[PDB]
Design a protein around this nucleic acid. Structure first.
Ligand SMILES: OC[C@H]1O[C@@](CO)(O[C@H]2O[C@H](CO)[C@@H](O)[C@H](O)[C@H]2O)[C@@H](O)[C@@H]1O
Ligand SMILES: [Mg+2]
Lengths: 416, 550
DNA sequence: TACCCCCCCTTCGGTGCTTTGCACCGAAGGGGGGGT
């Protein structure tokens, strides 16, 4: 007998109309079973072609999990649904979460299936299960309860969620808890044993509500205190060739867009004549100071760079080869909030697409912990290549926004 | 009765009011008799004093038939009608079918006219037919069912058809029913007796919901005609392809010709359409006659030799792996075969899309693999093992060095020339003892007159005047000059981001004659090192060659 | 003088860095095919 929270799209926007993409046999089988069980329980209901909306659906296995998990690509719906910051339902972000020694990620999306969804909004959650070789036309369902992966579900459920966590919070007031989409981020400074213990306590605490008023048992352990940053570094040589100094000048000239105090005059002078690239040329005494001064400037932080909660996050990724991937997170060009490097990820030295998929997931995870937002990615890959393979490697319950770029590396800027 | 589907008009829009165009006599007669039939059946209601709406009507002959199907021009209603989400996501393909002991193909008779339109929406389907060539005012009518020509009729019938079939499939889990619109395929591993029974049970369940299955469309003996194919118990094939053999070709003749070859490529291996498609490229209107290029009619001849033999595909065995094998056909053309046992192709196909001004075979092979992977997931729901004409070493060098992420699923080398290879490799480090060329190019924006040249450490120099050019063209030109005038090993320095972006992707083909000329030089070289420097920073011969061509 | 789906090949205009040229991409219109 729970009353439904009314929901409206942003004025001047239609619902999502995104086509369903082809699914593998094992994924269609997982969806048909999952949607059958959900239909028996009233969580979803069959619909017809008179509903003009559609949202893509597929299935994933989380890290080290053997059981399929239904995943809806609600990115279009999420961008067309009223921002709940205006409603005041939006969740605040704790600056302390990134400071804790261990942070565990808990899937709690199952809870959302207990709350009915506003009748007038259900039509926007339509999805279509396809069939192998098109044996059958698509089978369309829509949601009756709060669906996993929709940004409105945690907002509407926050009232019930805060009430459930209230005892555990008061008993252990040092533990930080943050809710993002279908996940719960629980951070503490305890020793690992007591940390997992407290996580186990919270699990059984959640079941006690689940008994009274994909699965909950899984848990992933982060360590945000140990998250390094990868800055811009100039090589160290005792002998420089013409080619080396040309590279150094080009790199410094690019970095000057980030650190304006950088100069290349004395170094450029060393390139006056027209000489073979290989030629070794001694550094002038004036040049040595310029390089050392530049290295000093690179060490200091960029001036006037800070997080604006009203601006979107953007992430760029570069493939450096040998399993090395660099990334930068920013809201304004050349004002990077974070830079980093990944190496020896899964699929390294065999699969590019798996490595990039892991990088995107890692970067999104950090962005949620640090700022409570997921960035929009600029992916160094062809559209067709990415769209063909990425669902085979996706292991998260959210999907960030992305676009495709092709930027040949003229300067080895973020990696030497 | 089939429950109706609630259908609305687009908010704040009203029904159609388009008056009937003049109709030729022969049609008016057949039209009136078709209307009266529908009246007796109850498919159209007679009321018309109160409904201001009218839509034009026309009639065309049914395929392979004396019979005439009435056509309603509903495009105005279509614009005003709510949008629908179509449930027909793709086309079934015979290569996805498993082999069945007993097979039946039957069609629902008068599909749209057996599903009752939404009660409230019926009034907007109103139309008028001149009773005797505008002699007598004529009679108004409304549709009681899904009308042909309405954008919502396919989706509504299709979804209704599925809801009717839903319990029959669930309660007969050892039957396989493929539904495309009204058209039905029914396969089982049951004795032909138990099969004929289940078939008759299906027709009753269908007739019970008002869906007839006339015997005229009830196929019982192979070859079953289905989706444009011919289904035999152990092999399938396409219904005969009619190749126009006309000596005079218009634009429309080649379009029809190329399209038919496309349709044939799904089973007839080796079909090529590049040369014929090049004939199509241009502002030529549909009527103008076009002579076949020498190489264009060589392609047509090779196609005939393929279409001479009769080809057949096999059916799918979910216990065997899928195998995809690709061959290079030159000029950006690729064909493939999907099979599980040698020479027993499930299906074939071709990839020939030329995307990008500058590309190479490796990129194209990757695109061909990606198309085949997606086509395979559509038909069989899994990725086939690949057999590709590229060395493992070639691929390893390509994908590890390329700056974009790229990948190919499990695959093995098949030694079938012409093999895919990289035609040149840029050095990673400057070449000791190689002449170093600093190049640059500039063109006057207003003039469209340009210079391209280079200066060398040894002091070799050159400047070439250029006409009707751009900054970017001159930048490529300077690189071309450096390659022409250098030894087998050369270091080249430029400030053209544009040029370096193109060349570093190791293209082997280009839409630009100049880039092709640069590619030709690069293949002849033994060691080439390209390096970028920023312009206007007073660097090397870069600042010295910038003054020569500016 | 009609409707819905899929496919390939071409053209064309919008978009963003390679910048005021050039490259990429999606839409639309030609054809093939299926069914009403
Ligand atoms: O890979 C992007 C591709 O996906 C589509 C269709 O699924 O759109 C989805 O992805 C976009 C990229 O983030 C989202 O912005 C969009 O909301 C989502 O539906 C295509 O539109 C796009 O080409
Ligand atoms: Mg210049």
């Amino acid at each position: 007998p729970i009353e439904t929270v009314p929901v409206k799209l942003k004025p001047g926007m239609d619902g999502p109309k995104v086509k369903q993409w082809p699914l593998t046999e094992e994924k269609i089988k997982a969806l048909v079973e999952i949607c059958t069980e959900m239909e028996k329980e009233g969580k979803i209901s069959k619909i017809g072609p008179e509903n003009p909306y559609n949202t893509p659906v597929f299935a994933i296995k989380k890290k080290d999990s053997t059981k399929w998990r239904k995943l809806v690509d609600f990115r279009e719906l999420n961008k067309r649904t009223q921002d709940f910051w205006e409603v005041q339902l939006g969740i605040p972000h704790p600056a302390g979460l990134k400071k804790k020694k261990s942070v565990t990620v808990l899937d709690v999306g199952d809870a959302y299936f207990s709350v009915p969804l506003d009748e007038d909004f259900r039509k926007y959650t339509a999805f279509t299960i396809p069939s192998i070789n098109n044996e059958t036309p698509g089978i369309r369902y829509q949601y009756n309860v709060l669906p996993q992966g929709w940004k409105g579900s945690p907002a509407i459920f926050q009232s019930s969620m805060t009430k459930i966590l209230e005892p555990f919070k008061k008993q252990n007031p040092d533990i930080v808890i943050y809710q993002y989409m279908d996940d719960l981020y629980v951070g503490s400074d305890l020793e690992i044993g007591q940390h997992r213990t407290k996580i186990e306590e919270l699990r059984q605490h959640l079941l006690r509500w689940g008994l009274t008023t994909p699965f909950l048992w899984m848990g992933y352990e982060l360590h945000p205190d140990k998250w390094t940053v990868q800055p811009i570094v100039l090589p160290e040589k005792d002998s420089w060739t013409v080619n080396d100094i040309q590279k150094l000048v080009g790199k410094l000239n690019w970095a000057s867009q980030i650190y304006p105090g950088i100069k290349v005059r004395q170094l450029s002078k060393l390139l006056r004549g027209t000489k073979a690239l290989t030629e070794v040329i001694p550094l002038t005494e004036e040049a040595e100071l310029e390089l050392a001064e530049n290295r000093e400037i690179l060490k200091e932080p960029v001036h006037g760079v800070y997080y604006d909660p009203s601006k979107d996050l953007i992430a760029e990724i570069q493939k450096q080869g040998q399993g090395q991937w660099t990334y930068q997170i920013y809201q304004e060009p050349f004002k990077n909030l974070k830079t980093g490097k990944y190496a020896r990820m899964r699929g390294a030295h065999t699969n590019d697409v798996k490595q990039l998929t892991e990088a995107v997931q890692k970067i999104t995870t950090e962005s949620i912990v640090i700022w409570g937002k997921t960035p929009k990615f600029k992916l160094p890959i062809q559209k067709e290549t990415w769209e063909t393979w990425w669902t085979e490697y996706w292991q998260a319950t959210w999907i960030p926004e992305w676009e495709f770029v092709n930027t040949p590396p003229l300067v080895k800027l973020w990696y030497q | 009765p089939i429950e109706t589907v609630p259908v609305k008009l687009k908010p704040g829009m009203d029904g159609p009011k388009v008056k009937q165009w003049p109709l030729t006599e022969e049609k008016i007669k057949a039209l009136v008799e078709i209307c009266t039939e529908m009246e007796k059946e109850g498919k159209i209601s007679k009321i018309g004093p109160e409904n201001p709406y009218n839509t034009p009507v026309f009639a065309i002959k049914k395929k392979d038939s004396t019979k005439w199907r009435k056509l309603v021009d509903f495009r105005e209603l279509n614009k005003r009608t709510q949008d629908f989400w179509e449930v027909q996501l793709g086309i079934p393909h015979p290569a996805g079918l498993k082999k069945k002991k007993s097979v039946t193909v039957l069609d629902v008779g008068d599909a749209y006219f057996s599903v009752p339109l939404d009660e409230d929406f019926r009034k907007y389907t109103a139309f008028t037919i001149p009773s005797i060539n505008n002699e007598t005012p004529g009679i108004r009518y409304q549709y009681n069912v899904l009308p042909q020509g309405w954008k919502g009729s396919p989706a509504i019938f299709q979804s209704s058809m599925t809801k009717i079939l839903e319990p029959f499939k669930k309660q007969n889990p050892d039957i396989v029913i493929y539904q495309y619109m009204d058209d039905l395929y029914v396969g089982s591993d049951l004795e032909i007796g138990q099969h004929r029974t289940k078939i008759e049970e299906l027709r009753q369940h269908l007739l019970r919901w008002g869906l007839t299955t006339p015997d005229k469309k009830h196929q019982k003996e192979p070859p079953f005609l289905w989706m444009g194919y011919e289904l035999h118990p152990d092999k399938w094939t396409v219904q005969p392809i009619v190749l126009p053999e006309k000596d005079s070709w218009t634009v429309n003749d080649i379009q029809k010709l190329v399209g038919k070859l496309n349709w044939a490529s799904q089973i007839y291996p080796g079909i090529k359409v590049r040369q014929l498609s090049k004939l199509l490229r241009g502002t030529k209107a549909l009527t103008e006659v076009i002579p076949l290029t020498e190489e264009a009619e060589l392609e047509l001849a090779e196609n005939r030799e393929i279409l001479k033999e009769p080809v057949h595909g096999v059916y799918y065995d979910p216990s065997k792996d899928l195998i995809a094998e690709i061959q290079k056909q030159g000029q950006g053309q690729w064909t493939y075969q999907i099979y599980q046992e040698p020479f027993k192709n499930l299906k074939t196909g071709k990839y020939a899309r030329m995307r990008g001004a500058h590309t190479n075979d490796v990129k194209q092979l990757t695109e061909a693999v990606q198309k085949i992977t997606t086509e395979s997931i559509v038909i069989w729901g899994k990725t086939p093992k690949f057999k590709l004409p590229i060395q493992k070493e070639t691929w390893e060098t390509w994908w590890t060095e390329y700056w974009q992420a790229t990948w190919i699923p499990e695959w093995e080398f098949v030694n079938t020339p012409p093999l895919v290879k990289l035609w040149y490799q840029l050095e990673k480090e400057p070449i000791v003892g190689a002449e170093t060329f600093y190049v640059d190019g500039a063109a006057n924006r207003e003039t469209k007159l340009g210079k391209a040249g280079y200066v060398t450490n040894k002091g070799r120099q050159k400047v070439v005047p250029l006409t009707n050019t751009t900054n970017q063209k001159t930048e490529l030109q300077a690189i071309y000059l450096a390659l022409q005038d250098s030894g087998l090993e050369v270091n080249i320095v430029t400030d053209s981001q544009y040029a370096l972006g193109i060349i570093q992707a190791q293209p082997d083909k280009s839409e630009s004659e100049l880039v092709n000329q640069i590619i030709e030089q690069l293949i002849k070289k033994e060691k080439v090192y390209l390096a970028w420097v920023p312009a206007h920073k007073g660097i090397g011969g870069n600042e010295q060659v910038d003054k020569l061509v500016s």
